[PDB]
Amino acid sequence: HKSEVAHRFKDLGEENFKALVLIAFAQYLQQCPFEDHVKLVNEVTEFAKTCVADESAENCDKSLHTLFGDKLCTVATLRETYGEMADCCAKQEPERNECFLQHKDDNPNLPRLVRPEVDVMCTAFHDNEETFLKKYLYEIARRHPYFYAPELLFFAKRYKAAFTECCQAADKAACLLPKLDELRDEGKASSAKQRLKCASLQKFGERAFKAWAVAHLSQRFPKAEFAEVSKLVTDLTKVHTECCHGDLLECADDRADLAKYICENQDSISSKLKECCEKPLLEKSHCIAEVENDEMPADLPSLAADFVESKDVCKNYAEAKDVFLGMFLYEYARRHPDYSVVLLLRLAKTYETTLEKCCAAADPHECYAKVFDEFKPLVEEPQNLIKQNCELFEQLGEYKFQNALLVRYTKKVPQVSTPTLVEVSRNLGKVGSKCCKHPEAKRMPCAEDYLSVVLNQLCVLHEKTPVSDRVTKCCTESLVNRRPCFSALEVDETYVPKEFNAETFTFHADICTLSEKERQIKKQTALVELVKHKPKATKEQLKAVMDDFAAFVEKCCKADDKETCFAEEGKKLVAASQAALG
Ligand SMILES: N[C@@H](Cc1cc(I)c(Oc2cc(I)c(O)c(I)c2)c(I)c1)C(=O)O
Ligand SMILES: CCCCCCCCCCCCCC(=O)O
Ligand SMILES: CCCCCCCCCCCCCC(=O)O
C-alpha cells in the first residue's frame, strides 16, 4: 500500500527477492563484474528490510521504477562503461525508465559460456553453493536480457536440483550430463518461443495473434463460455504486448492479475486448474501456462448446424465478421485438441474465404453448403505426413532416420550450407523421437510445437546469409503456410554438382577415438557432401556406398594399423565409389 518494496518483499520472500533483484540488474548492467552486483543486491535488500520494519521509513513511499532508476544512476562508471545510457539519468520517469529499455543490448558480445568438468562443478557446488549458483545466474541473465526473470528463476531451481541429486552419485557424470543437456535444450526452446511470439505480434498484427490465442485457449478450456474465452484472449493479448515491450515490472503485474482473474473464475474456466491455483504468487502464471486440457462436454451439438445449415449465417457474419469467425474457431478448436493450432487457423481462413465469395450471390445457402468438404484435404495433409514419417522412424532409428532426412533435404536445397543441413536434419530427427512416442491424439500439437522453433531457427540463419529464393519464399510466407511451403519444396533440377575433392572424402584414424556425437556428425557431414557431388544418385546407389563405408570404418578402427588402413583402403573406396556413382 504505502510501500511497494515492503510489499513485494513480504509476499515474494527474501530468497526469491534477492535472486530477482540480481537478474534484473544483470539484464541492464550487462558489463559490471559479479562482485559489483552482489553489492547492489545486498544494498537493495537492506533497503527493503528497513521498509518492512517501518512502512514510513525514508524513500519507502517511492515506486519501484523510481527506486530502480535512482539506484541504477548511482553506478559511478555508468557513462564510462555504458556511455549513452548514462544520458538517461538526466531524464524523469517514465522517460528515464523508457530510456533504459532502449539502451539494453539484446545480444552483447560476451564469450560463449563453456561447461566445465563434472568434478570441477560438483566441488565448487559443494564448497560454496550460493555463489556458484548466483554467479551462473548472473552469467545467463546478462546474456539473455529479455528472458522473463521469474522464468529464469524457475530454471535455476531445476539446476540446483540436478547438482543435489547428481553430485552425491557414484557415477556423477552418468547422472549430471544428460540432465544438463536437457535443461539447456529446454532453456533454448523456451527462449526461441519467447522471441518468436513477439516477432509475430509485430509483423502480422493483433488480429492474427488474437486468432492464434482463441484456438489455443479453447482447446484447453473447452468448457469455458465464448465470452469468457474472449475476455481471456483480450487480456492475454495485452500481456504479451506489454511483456514484449520488455518492461519487467509491468509485464509481471499484468501476468499476476491475469493469473488472479483465472483462479477466481476457476469453475467457469476449467476443472484442471486446481493445483496451479493453490501455488505461490511467483509460480501461478507459469503453472497455468503449462496446464493440461480439460475434457470436452461430450454433449456438444454439431458445427454444421450453426455454420452451414442455418439460413441466416451471412446475416450473423455481416453483423460482426471477426466475432462470428472467432466463434467458428472456438467451436472447431475445442472439439479438436488433436489439431495443431495452425491447422485450425488454416480452416477458419478457408471458411472465411468462402463466406466472402458466397454471401454475395443469389442463393447463399447453396453456395457454401459444401464447405466442410473442403476441410478434408487440409486436415489429412498434416496427418498423413505424421504417420508416414513416424512409421519410417520406427523402421530406422533416430540416427538412420536422420540420415534419410539428410539425403532428402540436401537434394531439395543443395545451395544450403553443409553444417546447416546437418544441424536442421539432426533437430528434425529429434522432433521425430520426441513426438512419435505419443498416441496419435497428441502428435500434431507436439510436432507444431517443435517445428515452429526449428523452422524459425532455420529462417533466421538464412536471414543473415540468404542462399535460396525458395527458402526465403517459405520464410516470408504467413506463419500458417510456412510449414506446408517447406513440405512442398521439390528436388533441385537446376542445381549443378560440386567438383570432386579428395580432401573432403579423406578419413584419418581420429574418428576411431571420437565420441558418438563426433563420429556421426563426421559421417553425416560426408554424406551431405556426397549428395552434393552426385545429386542424381538413387536411394540404392547411395545405401550401397554408405554400406561400404560403415564396414570400412570397422576394418580400420579394429586393425593392427590405424592410419595405414585408413589411407590404403580409403584409396580403394573413393575410386570404387566414384565408378559406382558414375
Ligand atoms: N541444435 C542443437 C540441439 C537442439 C535440438 C532441438 I529438436 C531443439 O528444439 C527444441 C524444441 C522444443 I518445443 C523443445 O521442447 C526442445 I527440449 C528442443 C533445440 I532449441 C536444440 C545442437 O545440437 O546444438
Ligand atoms: C476474437 C476475434 C478474433 C478472431 C479472428 C478470426 C480470424 C480468422 C482468420 C485466421 C487468421 C490467420 C491470420 C491471417 O492470415 O490474417
Ligand atoms: C565420391 C565418393 C566418396 C565416398 C565417401 C563416402 C562418404 C559416405 C559417408 C556416409 C556415412 C554412412 C553413415 C553410417 O554408416 O552410419
XYZ file of C-alpha atoms and ligand atoms in Angstrom:
638
model
C 0.000 0.000 0.000
C 2.367 2.694 1.235
C 5.467 0.779 0.172
C 5.824 -1.393 -2.930
C 9.272 -2.616 -1.883
C 7.984 -3.684 1.513
C 5.042 -5.439 -0.154
C 6.915 -7.331 -2.886
C 9.390 -8.410 -0.242
C 6.739 -9.788 2.073
C 4.910 -11.888 -0.483
C 7.910 -12.869 -2.640
C 10.247 -13.874 0.196
C 13.858 -12.973 0.968
C 15.432 -15.680 -1.228
C 13.318 -15.097 -4.337
C 13.664 -11.345 -3.805
C 17.465 -11.403 -3.700
C 17.649 -13.579 -6.788
C 15.254 -11.476 -8.896
C 16.924 -8.193 -7.980
C 20.089 -9.918 -9.152
C 18.662 -10.998 -12.514
C 17.052 -7.594 -13.004
C 20.299 -5.647 -12.529
C 22.334 -8.094 -14.616
C 19.992 -7.546 -17.558
C 20.726 -3.789 -17.713
C 24.232 -3.620 -16.293
C 25.447 -6.443 -18.524
C 29.073 -5.263 -18.202
C 29.619 -4.898 -14.455
C 31.528 -7.688 -12.668
C 29.812 -10.184 -10.362
C 31.044 -8.778 -7.039
C 29.519 -5.425 -8.080
C 26.020 -6.830 -8.488
C 26.273 -8.756 -5.234
C 26.846 -5.456 -3.511
C 23.887 -3.812 -5.240
C 21.634 -6.725 -4.246
C 22.646 -6.557 -0.553
C 22.081 -2.801 -0.528
C 18.640 -3.084 -2.097
C 17.777 -5.934 0.270
C 18.967 -3.933 3.233
C 16.682 -1.157 1.997
C 13.698 -3.479 1.530
C 14.041 -4.669 5.155
C 14.120 -1.152 6.523
C 10.729 -0.619 4.859
C 9.323 -3.923 6.134
C 10.173 -2.764 9.652
C 8.544 0.642 9.139
C 6.422 1.424 6.067
C 7.154 5.128 6.567
C 10.947 4.940 6.646
C 12.603 7.345 4.199
C 12.069 6.580 0.486
C 9.790 3.590 1.117
C 6.925 5.562 -0.372
C 8.524 5.745 -3.810
C 7.716 3.459 -6.751
C 9.847 0.504 -7.821
C 10.599 2.108 -11.193
C 11.844 5.239 -9.436
C 13.930 3.367 -6.873
C 15.367 1.225 -9.684
C 16.471 4.162 -11.829
C 17.878 6.109 -8.882
C 20.000 3.140 -7.894
C 20.988 2.480 -11.481
C 22.166 6.062 -11.890
C 24.321 5.643 -8.824
C 26.868 3.448 -10.634
C 29.911 5.760 -10.918
C 31.339 4.222 -14.108
C 27.939 4.311 -15.836
C 28.860 6.763 -18.591
C 32.412 5.454 -18.931
C 31.252 1.857 -19.395
C 27.803 2.149 -20.934
C 28.162 5.653 -22.344
C 24.919 6.814 -23.955
C 22.790 5.007 -21.345
C 24.090 7.401 -18.694
C 22.341 10.290 -20.512
C 19.124 8.586 -19.399
C 19.827 9.706 -15.820
C 19.159 13.305 -16.845
C 15.517 12.488 -17.588
C 12.443 11.928 -15.417
C 10.140 8.928 -15.077
C 8.518 7.498 -17.199
C 11.016 8.817 -19.719
C 14.068 7.736 -17.737
C 12.794 4.164 -17.410
C 11.627 4.302 -21.002
C 15.159 5.432 -21.901
C 16.746 2.480 -20.066
C 14.822 -0.112 -22.081
C 16.006 1.313 -25.394
C 19.672 1.075 -24.365
C 19.579 -2.581 -23.346
C 21.613 -4.648 -25.832
C 19.610 -7.750 -26.784
C 22.748 -9.582 -27.909
C 26.017 -8.318 -26.351
C 29.436 -9.677 -27.226
C 30.467 -11.954 -24.411
C 32.380 -15.243 -24.754
C 30.255 -18.360 -25.122
C 29.758 -19.883 -21.669
C 31.712 -23.156 -21.533
C 30.633 -26.137 -19.441
C 33.399 -27.142 -17.031
C 34.230 -30.611 -15.726
C 31.688 -32.502 -13.620
C 34.230 -32.813 -10.804
C 35.134 -29.149 -11.035
C 31.458 -28.160 -10.956
C 30.473 -30.587 -8.158
C 33.364 -29.472 -5.902
C 32.519 -25.793 -6.465
C 28.897 -26.616 -5.735
C 29.879 -28.386 -2.507
C 32.202 -25.696 -1.155
C 30.237 -22.503 -1.796
C 26.763 -23.438 -3.034
C 25.231 -19.956 -3.217
C 27.960 -18.082 -5.097
C 28.361 -20.999 -7.503
C 24.669 -20.720 -8.381
C 24.340 -16.927 -8.255
C 27.397 -16.413 -10.387
C 25.889 -18.599 -13.089
C 22.510 -16.949 -12.678
C 24.425 -13.742 -13.406
C 26.247 -15.116 -16.497
C 22.988 -16.390 -18.027
C 20.995 -13.261 -17.199
C 23.409 -10.742 -18.742
C 23.403 -12.841 -21.945
C 19.597 -13.046 -22.141
C 18.436 -9.534 -21.183
C 14.913 -10.231 -22.421
C 14.280 -13.567 -20.663
C 11.357 -13.150 -18.236
C 13.139 -13.191 -14.840
C 10.699 -15.367 -12.903
C 11.044 -17.968 -15.654
C 14.826 -17.821 -15.364
C 14.428 -18.373 -11.628
C 12.288 -21.484 -12.233
C 15.211 -22.865 -14.279
C 17.816 -22.101 -11.625
C 15.953 -24.297 -9.168
C 15.876 -27.237 -11.584
C 19.626 -26.741 -11.905
C 20.196 -26.681 -8.156
C 18.073 -29.810 -8.011
C 20.304 -31.665 -10.503
C 23.502 -30.763 -8.680
C 21.979 -32.088 -5.438
C 20.930 -35.407 -6.989
C 23.988 -35.972 -9.124
C 26.958 -34.767 -7.120
C 26.173 -37.371 -4.441
C 26.003 -40.165 -7.040
C 28.586 -42.903 -7.591
C 28.835 -42.074 -11.274
C 28.267 -38.321 -11.168
C 28.603 -37.702 -14.917
C 26.255 -40.524 -15.965
C 23.754 -38.664 -13.809
C 24.572 -34.996 -14.498
C 25.457 -34.685 -18.194
C 22.151 -35.955 -19.597
C 20.334 -33.616 -17.189
C 22.331 -30.543 -18.121
C 21.884 -31.254 -21.819
C 18.116 -31.497 -21.383
C 17.913 -28.268 -19.373
C 19.945 -26.414 -21.992
C 17.756 -27.519 -24.911
C 14.648 -26.798 -22.875
C 16.100 -23.415 -21.929
C 16.916 -22.632 -25.551
C 13.460 -23.754 -26.691
C 11.735 -21.546 -24.145
C 13.782 -18.548 -25.293
C 13.139 -19.090 -29.020
C 9.404 -19.390 -28.415
C 9.542 -16.212 -26.383
C 11.173 -14.016 -29.026
C 9.079 -15.795 -31.726
C 5.736 -14.728 -30.256
C 6.900 -11.123 -30.079
C 8.077 -11.219 -33.681
C 4.749 -12.493 -34.892
C 2.882 -9.874 -32.891
C 4.952 -7.251 -34.711
C 4.742 -8.485 -38.303
C 1.222 -9.916 -38.518
C -0.539 -7.729 -36.003
C -3.153 -8.152 -33.325
C -5.940 -9.834 -35.337
C -3.799 -12.818 -36.324
C -2.437 -13.048 -32.780
C -5.909 -12.968 -31.242
C -6.887 -15.654 -33.753
C -3.990 -17.810 -32.629
C -4.987 -17.348 -28.991
C -8.701 -18.150 -29.417
C -7.928 -21.568 -30.900
C -5.206 -22.239 -28.356
C -7.256 -21.187 -25.331
C -10.377 -23.094 -26.310
C -8.501 -26.357 -26.872
C -7.556 -26.195 -23.201
C -10.699 -24.699 -21.709
C -13.311 -26.457 -23.914
C -15.961 -26.000 -21.245
C -15.475 -22.247 -20.946
C -18.100 -19.915 -22.446
C -17.119 -17.990 -25.599
C -17.470 -14.651 -23.781
C -15.033 -15.976 -21.167
C -12.566 -17.121 -23.844
C -12.841 -13.685 -25.456
C -12.162 -11.905 -22.191
C -9.035 -14.013 -21.636
C -7.830 -13.557 -25.220
C -8.168 -9.794 -24.827
C -6.150 -9.780 -21.620
C -3.632 -12.342 -22.899
C -3.007 -10.067 -25.862
C -2.487 -7.110 -23.566
C 0.018 -9.101 -21.500
C 2.122 -10.224 -24.457
C 2.292 -6.727 -25.908
C 3.443 -5.402 -22.528
C 5.876 -8.259 -21.860
C 7.363 -7.962 -25.364
C 8.000 -4.286 -24.853
C 10.490 -5.591 -22.293
C 9.353 -3.843 -19.105
C 9.779 -6.481 -16.392
C 7.590 -4.885 -13.694
C 4.698 -4.065 -15.972
C 4.902 -7.494 -17.540
C 4.881 -9.116 -14.087
C 1.830 -7.294 -12.755
C -0.218 -7.953 -15.877
C 0.615 -11.666 -15.550
C -0.188 -11.708 -11.849
C -3.546 -10.054 -12.419
C -4.470 -12.488 -15.181
C -3.453 -15.422 -13.017
C -5.618 -13.881 -10.293
C -8.607 -13.434 -12.564
C -8.386 -17.019 -13.757
C -8.239 -18.709 -10.341
C -11.213 -16.742 -9.055
C -13.361 -17.859 -12.020
C -11.817 -21.320 -11.973
C -15.064 -23.384 -12.031
C -16.123 -21.276 -15.028
C -12.911 -21.932 -16.988
C -11.519 -25.394 -16.292
C -11.530 -28.136 -13.690
C -7.845 -28.855 -14.212
C -6.654 -25.569 -12.696
C -6.819 -26.679 -9.044
C -3.144 -27.318 -8.171
C -1.816 -24.343 -10.132
C -4.146 -22.031 -8.261
C -3.074 -23.139 -4.828
C 0.573 -22.375 -5.651
C 2.608 -19.307 -4.541
C 2.494 -15.975 -6.402
C 5.746 -16.476 -8.281
C 4.552 -19.728 -9.836
C 0.807 -19.407 -10.569
C 1.265 -17.986 -14.072
C 3.965 -20.439 -15.118
C 1.888 -23.370 -13.853
C -1.282 -22.276 -15.632
C 0.563 -21.794 -18.918
C 1.529 -25.472 -18.878
C -1.843 -26.785 -17.684
C -3.295 -29.811 -19.473
C -6.540 -29.700 -21.480
C -9.798 -30.083 -19.550
C -12.144 -32.671 -21.041
C -14.864 -31.675 -23.501
C -18.671 -31.747 -22.789
C -19.407 -34.806 -24.962
C -22.943 -33.408 -25.126
C -21.877 -30.942 -27.841
C -24.057 -30.348 -30.933
C -22.623 -30.267 -34.452
C -20.734 -27.490 -36.187
C -22.616 -27.876 -39.482
C -25.816 -26.808 -37.715
C -24.964 -23.184 -36.855
C -22.318 -22.673 -39.529
C -23.631 -24.419 -42.642
C -27.294 -25.287 -42.201
C -28.517 -22.074 -40.553
C -30.118 -19.820 -43.164
C -29.159 -16.521 -41.540
C -25.441 -17.322 -41.335
C -24.481 -14.403 -43.579
C -26.743 -12.121 -41.547
C -24.707 -13.033 -38.459
C -21.423 -12.802 -40.329
C -22.068 -9.324 -41.756
C -23.174 -8.003 -38.364
C -19.742 -8.743 -36.845
C -17.337 -10.724 -39.029
C -14.476 -11.250 -36.604
C -16.715 -12.321 -33.691
C -18.558 -14.819 -35.880
C -15.339 -16.299 -37.300
C -13.964 -16.193 -33.755
C -16.986 -18.277 -32.794
C -16.157 -20.662 -35.597
C -12.601 -21.176 -34.228
C -13.772 -21.533 -30.675
C -16.302 -24.118 -31.807
C -13.878 -26.025 -34.001
C -10.851 -25.830 -31.674
C -12.489 -27.255 -28.566
C -13.719 -30.352 -30.388
C -10.217 -30.922 -31.633
C -7.434 -30.835 -29.024
C -5.719 -33.076 -31.583
C -5.366 -30.443 -34.298
C -2.341 -28.149 -34.421
C -3.286 -24.509 -33.899
C -2.156 -23.581 -37.414
C -4.394 -26.313 -38.877
C -7.404 -24.736 -37.163
C -6.243 -21.331 -38.475
C -5.987 -22.783 -41.953
C -9.627 -23.949 -41.648
C -11.058 -20.672 -40.338
C -9.163 -18.897 -43.143
C -10.768 -21.221 -45.712
C -14.211 -20.797 -44.128
C -13.688 -17.005 -44.266
C -12.775 -17.021 -47.951
C -15.986 -18.926 -48.568
C -18.396 -16.701 -46.639
C -16.859 -13.785 -48.556
C -17.331 -15.285 -52.014
C -20.744 -16.726 -51.130
C -22.683 -14.183 -49.111
C -22.530 -12.157 -52.319
C -24.592 -14.462 -54.518
C -28.242 -15.109 -55.339
C -28.757 -18.192 -53.198
C -26.107 -18.254 -50.436
C -27.335 -21.403 -48.668
C -26.294 -23.462 -51.693
C -23.029 -21.657 -52.492
C -21.233 -22.525 -49.261
C -23.183 -25.693 -48.429
C -20.142 -27.815 -49.327
C -17.544 -26.006 -47.172
C -16.742 -28.861 -44.788
C -15.972 -30.943 -47.880
C -13.050 -28.617 -48.462
C -11.657 -29.139 -44.975
C -10.986 -32.842 -45.569
C -7.820 -32.397 -47.657
C -6.461 -29.685 -45.326
C -6.896 -31.926 -42.304
C -5.368 -35.003 -43.922
C -2.180 -33.433 -45.285
C -0.587 -32.927 -41.839
C -1.846 -36.302 -40.577
C -0.518 -38.376 -43.486
C 2.909 -36.726 -43.074
C 2.965 -37.780 -39.411
C 2.071 -41.464 -39.901
C 4.359 -41.673 -42.924
C 7.272 -40.133 -41.030
C 6.655 -41.783 -37.674
C 6.488 -45.156 -39.414
C 9.808 -44.600 -41.175
C 11.291 -43.519 -37.856
C 10.326 -46.919 -36.390
C 11.994 -48.847 -39.182
C 15.251 -46.905 -38.800
C 16.361 -45.405 -35.501
C 16.933 -41.764 -34.558
C 20.320 -41.912 -36.304
C 19.490 -43.677 -39.577
C 16.227 -41.746 -39.671
C 18.298 -38.579 -39.564
C 20.427 -39.828 -42.438
C 17.275 -40.177 -44.574
C 16.040 -36.644 -43.920
C 19.560 -35.505 -44.691
C 19.539 -37.075 -48.148
C 16.006 -35.806 -48.753
C 16.665 -32.157 -47.896
C 20.138 -31.902 -49.400
C 18.505 -32.742 -52.722
C 15.805 -30.139 -52.012
C 18.107 -27.178 -51.472
C 21.749 -28.150 -52.252
C 22.536 -24.436 -52.139
C 22.329 -24.545 -48.345
C 25.447 -24.974 -46.218
C 26.529 -28.469 -45.182
C 26.817 -27.661 -41.477
C 23.332 -26.084 -41.543
C 21.749 -29.086 -43.296
C 23.326 -31.395 -40.721
C 22.018 -29.311 -37.824
C 18.489 -28.948 -39.223
C 18.345 -32.646 -40.051
C 19.520 -33.614 -36.600
C 16.830 -31.494 -34.931
C 14.117 -32.777 -37.253
C 15.275 -36.252 -36.298
C 14.854 -35.393 -32.630
C 11.363 -33.993 -33.096
C 10.635 -37.399 -34.590
C 11.709 -39.289 -31.461
C 10.091 -36.745 -29.148
C 6.670 -36.797 -30.832
C 6.250 -40.195 -32.431
C 6.294 -41.854 -28.999
C 2.931 -40.153 -28.260
C -0.509 -41.509 -29.257
C -1.990 -40.082 -32.470
C -4.164 -37.748 -30.378
C -1.131 -35.683 -29.270
C 1.286 -35.997 -32.174
C 0.248 -32.997 -34.308
C 0.221 -30.494 -31.476
C 3.652 -31.821 -30.490
C 5.102 -31.508 -33.984
C 3.700 -27.992 -34.382
C 5.419 -27.014 -31.156
C 8.881 -28.287 -32.096
C 8.712 -27.432 -35.783
C 7.969 -23.780 -35.064
C 11.252 -23.054 -33.286
C 13.265 -25.242 -35.654
C 11.838 -23.536 -38.758
C 12.283 -20.091 -37.293
C 15.833 -21.013 -36.330
C 16.361 -22.085 -39.931
C 14.887 -18.885 -41.371
C 16.984 -16.688 -39.108
C 20.257 -18.169 -40.391
C 19.065 -17.876 -43.975
C 18.116 -14.344 -42.962
C 21.761 -13.474 -42.358
C 23.232 -15.316 -45.313
C 20.454 -15.831 -47.884
C 21.185 -18.639 -50.331
C 17.839 -19.592 -51.867
C 14.776 -17.672 -53.037
C 12.640 -20.726 -52.272
C 13.684 -20.941 -48.613
C 13.228 -17.184 -48.426
C 9.787 -17.597 -50.020
C 8.666 -20.094 -47.413
C 10.349 -17.974 -44.739
C 8.413 -14.848 -45.739
C 5.012 -16.501 -46.272
C 2.408 -16.434 -43.484
C 3.031 -18.385 -40.273
C 0.180 -20.625 -41.448
C 1.719 -21.561 -44.807
C 5.274 -21.718 -43.538
C 5.361 -25.469 -42.950
C 3.168 -26.521 -45.931
C 5.503 -24.385 -48.038
C 8.629 -26.257 -46.901
C 6.808 -29.563 -47.312
C 6.112 -28.614 -50.944
C 9.748 -27.953 -51.925
C 10.868 -30.267 -54.689
C 14.229 -31.621 -55.820
C 16.523 -29.005 -57.338
C 16.818 -29.958 -61.012
C 18.702 -26.785 -61.948
C 21.448 -27.464 -59.366
C 24.916 -28.148 -60.761
C 27.017 -30.671 -58.747
C 30.228 -29.728 -56.925
C 33.553 -30.894 -58.364
C 35.190 -33.823 -56.588
C 37.572 -33.070 -53.731
C 39.896 -35.736 -52.367
C 40.299 -33.856 -49.088
C 36.568 -33.772 -48.290
C 36.471 -37.578 -48.521
C 39.682 -38.487 -46.665
C 39.355 -40.090 -43.222
C 42.171 -40.434 -40.700
C 42.011 -42.752 -37.678
C 40.844 -39.858 -35.473
C 37.205 -40.816 -35.938
C 38.195 -44.003 -34.120
C 38.929 -42.115 -30.889
C 35.916 -39.802 -31.094
C 32.607 -39.794 -29.228
C 29.308 -40.928 -30.729
C 28.354 -37.286 -31.267
C 31.592 -36.769 -33.199
C 31.613 -39.894 -35.357
C 28.051 -39.337 -36.571
C 28.438 -35.641 -37.356
C 31.598 -36.628 -39.223
C 29.785 -39.291 -41.201
C 26.670 -37.172 -41.739
C 28.856 -34.296 -42.982
C 30.463 -36.575 -45.571
C 27.008 -37.868 -46.566
C 25.715 -34.381 -47.362
C 28.918 -33.698 -49.291
C 28.310 -36.991 -51.057
C 24.821 -35.962 -52.170
C 26.049 -32.517 -53.322
C 28.652 -34.150 -55.556
C 26.308 -36.700 -57.135
C 22.687 -35.425 -56.680
C 21.259 -37.866 -59.232
C 22.107 -40.919 -57.143
C 19.447 -43.455 -56.183
C 18.479 -44.402 -52.638
C 20.012 -47.709 -53.769
C 23.317 -46.491 -55.194
C 23.575 -44.378 -52.064
C 22.662 -47.050 -49.497
C 25.340 -49.170 -51.134
C 28.116 -46.614 -50.659
C 27.124 -45.967 -47.054
C 27.260 -49.724 -46.632
C 30.840 -49.934 -47.894
C 31.619 -47.019 -45.604
C 30.058 -48.490 -42.465
C 32.258 -51.594 -42.501
C 35.251 -49.652 -43.879
C 35.470 -47.800 -40.569
C 35.233 -51.000 -38.528
C 38.002 -52.559 -40.655
C 40.332 -49.658 -39.836
C 39.301 -48.932 -36.244
C 39.954 -52.539 -35.255
C 43.124 -53.280 -37.230
C 46.729 -53.557 -36.043
C 47.474 -50.439 -38.098
C 45.189 -47.418 -37.863
C 46.400 -44.672 -40.221
C 47.793 -47.074 -42.820
C 44.468 -48.920 -43.187
C 42.512 -45.659 -43.479
C 44.794 -44.415 -46.285
C 45.257 -47.670 -48.203
C 41.691 -48.975 -48.059
C 40.485 -45.387 -48.352
C 42.018 -45.006 -51.790
C 40.088 -48.115 -52.816
C 36.709 -46.832 -51.577
C 36.898 -43.406 -53.209
C 37.848 -44.937 -56.568
C 35.326 -47.783 -56.399
C 32.560 -45.429 -55.218
C 33.263 -42.854 -57.916
C 32.807 -45.551 -60.566
C 29.585 -46.719 -58.929
C 28.038 -43.243 -58.777
C 29.257 -42.642 -62.327
N 20.639 -27.958 -32.438
C 21.052 -28.190 -31.003
C 20.060 -29.163 -30.366
C 18.569 -28.797 -30.399
C 17.572 -29.674 -30.925
C 16.209 -29.271 -30.912
I 14.777 -30.586 -31.685
C 15.791 -28.058 -30.411
O 14.450 -27.676 -30.392
C 13.618 -27.935 -29.267
C 12.290 -27.513 -29.387
C 11.414 -27.737 -28.302
I 9.436 -27.112 -28.471
C 11.800 -28.390 -27.057
O 10.953 -28.579 -26.070
C 13.157 -28.780 -27.029
I 13.855 -29.722 -25.317
C 14.074 -28.582 -28.082
C 16.781 -27.175 -29.887
I 16.227 -25.331 -29.115
C 18.143 -27.558 -29.892
C 22.551 -28.649 -31.005
O 22.792 -29.815 -31.365
O 23.404 -27.819 -30.644
C -11.838 -12.673 -31.178
C -11.729 -12.292 -32.640
C -10.526 -12.960 -33.299
C -10.958 -13.920 -34.396
C -10.427 -13.516 -35.766
C -10.637 -14.644 -36.774
C -9.613 -14.595 -37.902
C -9.585 -15.906 -38.686
C -8.566 -15.859 -39.812
C -7.326 -16.686 -39.492
C -6.152 -15.800 -39.061
C -4.907 -16.106 -39.881
C -4.115 -14.794 -39.898
C -4.218 -14.094 -41.262
O -3.982 -14.754 -42.305
O -4.526 -12.878 -41.281
C 32.713 -39.746 -54.241
C 32.592 -40.909 -53.274
C 33.173 -40.560 -51.903
C 32.846 -41.628 -50.857
C 32.661 -41.015 -49.471
C 31.705 -41.824 -48.603
C 31.052 -40.954 -47.539
C 29.737 -41.558 -47.068
C 29.582 -41.473 -45.556
C 28.182 -41.881 -45.129
C 28.148 -42.406 -43.701
C 27.121 -43.523 -43.546
C 26.601 -43.378 -42.108
C 26.647 -44.710 -41.338
O 27.263 -45.694 -41.810
O 26.066 -44.767 -40.235
